[PDB]
Amino acid sequence: MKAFILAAGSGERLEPITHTRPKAFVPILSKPLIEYQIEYLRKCGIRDITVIVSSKNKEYFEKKLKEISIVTQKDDIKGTGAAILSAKFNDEALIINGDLFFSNEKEICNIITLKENAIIGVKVSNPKDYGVLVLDNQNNLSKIIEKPEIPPSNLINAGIYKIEYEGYWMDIGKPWNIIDVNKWALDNLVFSQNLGNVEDNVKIKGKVIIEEDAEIKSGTYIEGPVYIGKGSEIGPNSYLRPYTILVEKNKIGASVEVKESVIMEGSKIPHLSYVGDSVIAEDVNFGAGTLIANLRFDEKEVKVNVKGKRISSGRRKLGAFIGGHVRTGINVTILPGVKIGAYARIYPGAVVNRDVGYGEFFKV
Amino acid sequence: MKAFILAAGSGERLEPITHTRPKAFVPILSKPLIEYQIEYLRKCGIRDITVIVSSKNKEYFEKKLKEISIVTQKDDIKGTGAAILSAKFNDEALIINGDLFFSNEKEICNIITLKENAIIGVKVSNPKDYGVLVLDNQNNLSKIIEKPEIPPSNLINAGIYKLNSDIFTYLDKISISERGELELTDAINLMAKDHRVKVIEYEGYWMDIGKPWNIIDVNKWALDNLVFSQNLGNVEDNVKIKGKVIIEEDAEIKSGTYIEGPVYIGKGSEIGPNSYLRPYTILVEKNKIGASVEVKESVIMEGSKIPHLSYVGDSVIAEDVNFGAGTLIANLRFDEKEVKVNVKGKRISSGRRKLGAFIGGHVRTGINVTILPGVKIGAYARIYPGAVVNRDVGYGEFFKV
Amino acid sequence: MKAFILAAGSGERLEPITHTRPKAFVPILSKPLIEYQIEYLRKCGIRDITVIVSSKNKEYFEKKLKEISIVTQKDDIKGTGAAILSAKFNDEALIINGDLFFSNEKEICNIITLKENAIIGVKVSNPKDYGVLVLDNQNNLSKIIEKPEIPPSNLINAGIYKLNSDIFTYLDKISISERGELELTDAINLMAKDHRVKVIEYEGYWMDIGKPWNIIDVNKWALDNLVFSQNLGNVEDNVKIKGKVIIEEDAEIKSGTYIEGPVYIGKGSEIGPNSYLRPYTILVEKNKIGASVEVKESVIMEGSKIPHLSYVGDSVIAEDVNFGAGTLIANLRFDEKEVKVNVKGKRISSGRRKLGAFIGGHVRTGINVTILPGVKIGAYARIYPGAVVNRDVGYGEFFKV
């Protein structure tokens, strides 16, 4: 049985994260999204896995993977969903959307035994987004109607094609979903351990994962669940609160407080800062005194521009989404929902009250 | 013996605190000002206590007070005089101003034995405010001069009276004052021209809570005199504690916190990790103090939260306030002169070299807010992130630059 | 053998430090620069030491030094040449530039035995600044070329001379230089045309303190070489200490403090609670470092205080300074190019990728002040709360936006 993972989108809705990485390598704890997919396919025995990507997303993927077939897309644009065609298979195949996270693999294992065409569906609370599966009287696919303002049922297209899905399901469309899955993963996929190094006068409570070569210095105080990734350097006198995820080689410093945030590879928050309910991408540097607001005065849900459309995040508390290789000056101030583009620089003292462009030098 | 507490001012001079509570419920440690009064009256045996309030806030008082008589004032005319006109007594009564804090009750106990009209006087360093008692050659009340500028003595009206039904006569005689009010003090002045009106000098600690920095004053004094080192709450390891520290029940204090007394930590409060409470920090109830937050000589009222990266010095923060991360208060002027505060539109020295801010109830500050010395921020205000607050801020104001 | 220390420059290049002290009293750890000089002279036995200063600051030097000879410079004519014209010596003398720090004294000891004119030279990486010594075929002084651009060798003038009375002759011969000064180097250049003038190469550590970041340079070196882990002070529990840490007497260090050496904590200082001193923190004397304050690679001079919520990196803060809560120093530029500093009105690279600020004596910053890399702030300045300091700030300036 062949299998295909459909990347090749350009996750615009997941900017600024996707300015610098394909959505396939969105980190969930230590591992990129696509690795979970490959991993769970192999638990069904699949072995021959191909990823449909776009040049010049073309690898990248090659650098990152890893004994797997990388094949590009061509060449009009639409689908659905692609194209599709760039995949070469005779007989059957397993097609899986490359922006899915799913917990168990059991329904994929089950679906590949069948010789009829079959697809997986999943129940959700918000079927008015996603494509709803309408079934006939013998529970086969009548049609997939999409955006149906008037949703016939709660059963939607789970995006695995060759059955109702059981476990945890999430597509990573908008940036705050990066928080969603990472919270879930920290709750479900990993367990209290310490392969790193912790000094005296460090308080630790609840589920705390400390990976190898991670240093945690005196005065630090950790309230779980927390994930501290390999090579990270915490403290002295840091404070990590529940659902802090530091994916790899992160610097958290004196008088710095993190909460319910995903902070990606190599990013550093060295002094006098509070990061709440945020996603900070790779190789970011916060200047001393950089602060993120995560609550609006009226306590209404924080809104975010996603493809130029102003949209509720469904979160009462949401911070910022910082792109890769951003540097903030000292005493920077960032407002709720704000997106800051990859490679931006925020001039000292700035109050960031609007989205900031790729490469922008935002100085007042 | 009946007793009346006069509590139907709108304490304008105590704004912003009084935007959201009657001055009678200004917290001194865990207890409201009026409760100390009722408490100390009962130590004299008084039992029948009535509070003259203004409808509305009639009702408030009803919610808060339990088996004490709540009676409103007549809505036409204002004044302490107008207040007892709504008071029904009898023969004698004990009248006490509802903005007073006094330590011992001994002179009230003493004064209520006499059957002459008598009032209590008290020596202060600034008699040019308050009403000065001028006495005759036999130490009875000649007259009460209001804010004399040329003060005959230091002995001023302590605002505890024992008075007979005759005052109601003199209350009709006298008419409205310069500020549009029916001053009881005028009535007493006629009464002393005369009944013989006896003037008992007060011994202990005395303070009226007129201006907002007096909230700090009494609370320091209470922490120094009325309570003693204890811990009914929970303290983690690596918490340093020095001096007088009171930790009330259900109060959590987390590792890294460092406390230099005297400090009062009220019930339900959550301190740390890595907080720093310095001398005369008063957290009245259910306060959140967080990582890299430092408090000093400040009264922080019910339910207010300072969760990150802030310094609060020499300030009064009222109830259900929220400081955004990085909110700072300045408490010293560049020239080190005494910090000035606008009180009823008048710019006035606080007598303090170090004074921070007075924040009203339900204020929220954004992150990286910066507040200057002496500033008043009105109840329900919102300060925009990054704002520099260099002027008083209105009730409800969205101050955004 | 007489000796003269030349200390009558303006040290303009070392502003703002020199607004309030002569360069001779730039602190290197606990001791002023000149004391190291005197100290190391005496290790050669010299005993009769004179310092050529500028009246006033005559001044000063008298208050700080006895009984070392203090002698002013004369006639509204400047220069090292003008300096020794005020120096009175028959026969020989040792002349040493009063802005030098040198580790060993061995070459001075050696040079004073000779009876020829001799000077010390020293190899450096940047000989295009400084005066290069060109030697003849028998290693005596051919000439000193000033800032050659095409540097013949790496061997430059170390600014220690042994000279005979003959120099006074050559001092009258030569006349004013391009920059309006009487250069002693010109006199020595004539003298070498010739007396035979011997050039001894210097061995150890050598540094002139011309620009403000050199204060950091020597202080790092001193902390690495001249002092060793000890604790004559007091340290509370939950204080972490790593690496070389010097704690002088009457210094208090409170719980939560975390120290990563090498660090020097001068006498009388008060650290913590929850402070964080990182490598090459030098607190020279009586310094206050407070909660949620972090210092790094910085020299912080007598009596200065950083009490709350601040980060000082790669900076020099002079005496009796006060940083308001939330005062931050930026030490890195966005492009990571070397930080530039105005030095005598010329914009100049510091050679440092990471450089913070140079704060003059008696400066006060308001809360939430924000200071940019390379910035100089003049003595006695005041920075208004919330200000972003993005330019040099004047002596006495009230910088408010």
Ligand SMILES: O=c1ccn([C@@H]2O[C@H](COP(=O)(O)OP(=O)(O)OP(=O)(O)O)[C@@H](O)[C@H]2O)c(=O)[nH]1
């Ligand atoms: O109409 C009134 C006026 C005053 N009082 C009561 O008399 C006592 C002393 O009355 P004050 O004369 O101090 O009036 P005030 O408290 O409203 O002062 P401002 O800050 O508004 O200037 C206070 O406890 C007050 O409640 C009344 O009961 N009714």
Ligand SMILES: O=c1ccn([C@@H]2O[C@H](COP(=O)(O)OP(=O)(O)OP(=O)(O)O)[C@@H](O)[C@H]2O)c(=O)[nH]1
């Ligand atoms: O007129 C002078 C000038 C300089 N000197 C002293 O001789 C040595 C050589 O001084 P330099 O002539 O090399 O310059 P400078 O160090 O004075 O530079 P500024 O930072 O002051 O601009 C220095 O230690 C200085 O103090 C004098 O004695 N007299």
